[model samples]
Target: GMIDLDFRKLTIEECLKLSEEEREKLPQLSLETIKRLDPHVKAFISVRENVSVEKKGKFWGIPVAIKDNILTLGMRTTCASRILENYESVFDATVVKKMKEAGFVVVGKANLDEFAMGSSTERSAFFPTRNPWDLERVPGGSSGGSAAAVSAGMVVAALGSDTGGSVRQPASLCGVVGYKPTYGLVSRYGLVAFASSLDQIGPITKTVRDAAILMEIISGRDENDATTVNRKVDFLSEIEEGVSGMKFAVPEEIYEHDIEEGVSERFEEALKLLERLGAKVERVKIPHIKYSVATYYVIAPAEASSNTRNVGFGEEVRRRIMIGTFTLSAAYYEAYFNKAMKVRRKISDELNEVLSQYDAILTPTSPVTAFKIGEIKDPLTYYLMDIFTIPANLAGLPAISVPFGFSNNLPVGVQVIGRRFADGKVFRIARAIEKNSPYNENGMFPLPEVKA
Candidate 1:
């Protein structure tokens, strides 16, 4: 470890670069940290206190945390819900199988919203994961646990499922890197269904390089998931390619809604920073993206309606299912779902027009930073928090949240969204920002102020 008993600031690439003897000690050490801090942070629902540590492959003994919603053959996968609280997977998900194949140790199953339904982990039936930066503030969710563990350096990286903003939002609020791959780039075979079409598993890590490395290891065509793209996209080889000569667009339409002051302030600073880094930048309008939230609600819910039966789910899950049922009902199908599908196409087409011509689309990952638990009361207000993130999922584009600066003393994430299958390009742009960020070392140049 770079700093004695202070491995929390180390990135996945940093850990891998360690000497063989040092790298081999990561798993046990990672789990030990979890045992010591989890009582206060509450990031994981379950953990492996013991390990059969060994060097198995390129991944060796590196440790990673998995969202509890994804299946893990050797661990209990509760999806943070009572219905499956005692359930364990008989076989691994394609992603988990790949992780095991690479020799990464499972630190534990990270907590999440019940069935991945809520914007914040407060909906988690068991517990909410606290932000490592400020323990009293709620880490954004439903991937809060994944983001928290990575930020706290409890693990080298963590796997999370992003339906809308699950992976990116949490990472943004927690001041780590979160990536949502082009939909279908990573297999979704073992994840508990939330919204089949919109649901995609992504990585939450301390750096863009670690994310690229994790993405490299877990993505590829998997026979079990027909939605997986047929070819693998390279992620790490060109990561250091700076943003110079790239074209980035800021969809003017996203600004129609009010953005928090600090978020907008830091966002403006990053936009200027990108220009200084030698990228061509412009502010452009997206015609149908304003309807993205409505389009998402209808389609995602209708797709989700088929899975999960009854009262075992948390309130948000129950609420979403009811919305899906209403939208998919025989009488309302044409009135709601059909209109939404048309709008979805419009949003997709509109985004494609901009993405096809630009290197990436930029924005703030969340409208506001981490909020205290119960700070938001209505679900509608909670849903609006994802306004900037849903467009990427609706269009199946690649997007990432990189920590840029702090707001209200909390981290603010600047996002870069790219065309489908151009996940690596987004990685390149994010890596540029990461290396140049005042708060990052590639350039913490002060690490994230995590006291957890």
Candidate 2:
């Protein structure tokens, strides 16, 4: 099999040297090559049959994959579930329209967990996407297909939504850069709803700069989404600024327990790297962080119940809806949903207070590295994996997961979160880390070999 190209690593001068046919054939060849790779990587629900060669705008001829949950005008957008297996959108999602305007071709629809309900892609009614690093392991989901596609070099970049670390967690597992913009920074107009309050669309890419470039293209206030904030800025303008003299807080509560030994060691090394870059790293306490997982499960499922009423949800989606409805029922509304809401506010407040003094807060993106496919059976254990990423969604802050190092041959990611609407700040810190890291100086994490 041919080696997959890494476009994000190329300079503009280098890009211009490629023939027009060469540029257009890149994604098509990648998709074909990835399909050939064994222990299969089922990253897409549908791949375009006849590739278009339109060279008109900013991302002209560049291939980008869209998460199936996001609407596409003529493509089948199955959320990797039988329910929407044949459903196609009548109109383009806001992000999709913007990408088209910017000359980004929709290579295909990426597979995802049924209604974005599970921590792993295994919940998809369709086949689960395999980790490119190791076929036996799972790719984190419901954005697993998108993450895996980027990791396997199937596409230069892809879009995914984060309800509870859906984007960041999978990106970490796949060893790539994932950015969940401030909740209102990106519009949710065409994204299928999971948890209205927590759902957000983000970019999963090969490098921090690619993520920033995607943010600049996809982020803006949309007339269709009332929740979108009416603000705009150039994300790439200041991303190269180093992290010298920046102050970052490390929450003691998050790292002290429930984390894997290898992951924890990699995280410590990441912190030291940041310190070496002249960032002031210190320990800070977020006392209410301990309740994030429990509170998130309650609040997210409650919202899910209301959103999934007519969508014909799958098994996991049905499970969450049932749990949510019971919590919002007359008998327990105040007892469960209300209490979770109150705790959510407390978590948000704690984050706000910390960001007031520190430029960003750092943590391991996930407690552990990617595990073998179908390895986890207990529901509670699956839910617990989201502990580190829930707080940012709860607070509606900008957060990014950057590949830090490896753990027992698996990749580890370090997350950096910033104040609400401080998307640029988060990117700046992440870019600095990526610039100094071996993963960036070297080529992308090694590609998986598909045997005959």
Please tell me which predicted candidate would have the highest TM-score against the true structure. 1
For model 1 the TM-score comes to 0.93
**lDDT by residue (tens digit), candidate 2, 1-452:** 12224443332223445677667666566556556652378888888765657778856766778888899987888878797888978888998998889877787888788988888898889888889888788889889999988887677688999998999999999998889999888889999876878878999988888889889989999999999888885678889898999999999986568688889998898888888989899999888999998888778876776565775548879899898877566345446898999899999999999999999999999999999998999887888888889999999999999998888789899999999988988999998888888655552444444342
Cα-lDDT of candidate 1:
0.86
Model 2, global lDDT: 0.83
TM-score list, all predictions: 0.93, 0.91
Question: Model 1: per-residue lDDT, tens digit, 108-187?
Answer: 99999998998889889998888887888888999999898888878889999999989999999998889999988899
Residue-level error in angstroms, candidate 1, position 124: 0.8
Those runs of model 2 whose alpha carbons end farther than 4 Å from true positions after fitting are 1-19, 308-331, 442-452
The best candidate by lDDT is 1
Clashing pairs in 1: 440-444, 441-444
**Cα error, candidate 1, residue 379 (Å):** 2.4
Q: How many backbone collisions does model 1 have?
A: 2
